[PDB]
Structure formats: structure tokens, C-alpha cells
Design a protein around this nucleic acid. Structure first.
Lengths: 56, 56, 56
DNA sequence: GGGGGGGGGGA
DNA sequence: CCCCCCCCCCA
């Protein structure tokens, strides 16, 4: 799960737990894919949205 | 083809065209889906990276 | 790629293959976006036709 | 495995 | 809407 910028590990980590509770999902191997994936989906969606903001 | 932040359309377009040149691919109907697709993959990668950077 | 109705996956899959054959198009990354796209166009066309028929 | 963000098409 | 891609991230 390496990132482009490892120094951001802390950042995403916060946003991760944030989105988790929002959708009400428990990031664990005992959970479905559509559940663990929905999180990573929102994370990417937000990172993109922010980047598009600092360019508009 | 609505973007998350349509106000960035012009910025992402210039990014698209510049990446196409750097990649040597000529965007178009007659281009392979792989070549066209690669430009879109770079946009997301760079946007995600820039987000992580200017954040964490 | 998640279709409106995932359960239709198998059916659209067969229609796709049958359309590819009629068109003489080989679906793939190295195939032009136009050739690949042509197939998706027929699929939507036939689906809309079926819906208009079984609707009166 | 999944979700999301982009690229190029066709109907 | 469907087709073919590429990328990011979660697990």
C-alpha cells in the first residue's frame, strides 16, 4: 500500500478513519471488498478533488 | 465527462495535452485504447501526488 | 465497468461478444478506441430497442 | 477483490 | 448508457 509520497502516510491515515465511520465501514480482512474498497474510493476521489482545487 | 471541479477544466486540459506530448501519444479515435488510456492514468497519478504533497 | 444491473453481466457479456463477431472487431487494449467503442454503441442501441419494445 | 479519478470512442 | 484502457487508494 505504498504511496507516491510516504510522508503523507499520516495525512491519509486521518482521512481514512474519517471516511470509514462516515460510510460506517470496518476496515478489516473480515469485511467485504465492496466495503474495504468504498473507503479507498473516497480517499482517491478527495485527493483528486483537492488537487483540482489547487489548480483551478 | 464532468470533472469533480469543472472550474479546473482548462487546467486539466493543458495537463492532458502536455502529458500526451511527453508520452508521445496522439489523442484520438484512431489511437489504441491503451495509448489514450495512459494519458488519463497520468493525470490521476499526478493529481493524487500533488494532493498528498500539498497536504502531508 | 459496473453495469446499471450487475446481474445482467452474463447477458451483456454474450451480446458484446456476438456484436464483436458481427463487426469483425477484436476487443482489446491494442485495439483502436473507435473499434472498441463501436461495440459499446451497438450494445446501448439494442438495449434501448428492447426496452422500448417491452414497454409498448 | 473493490471503489474512485482520468483518456479515447459508439449509439 | 455501453466498449477498451491507465492510474490512485482500501483490504
Amino acid at each position: 500500500a505504498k504511496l507516491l509520497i510516504p510522508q503523507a502516510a499520516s495525512a491519509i491515515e486521518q482521512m481514512k478513519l474519517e471516511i470509514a465511520s462516515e460510510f460506517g465501514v470496518q476496515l478489516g480482512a473480515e469485511t467485504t471488498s465492496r466495503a474495504n474498497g468504498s473507503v479507498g474510493g473516497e480517499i482517491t476521489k478527495r485527493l483528486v478533488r483537492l488537487a483540482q482545487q489547487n489548480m483551478g
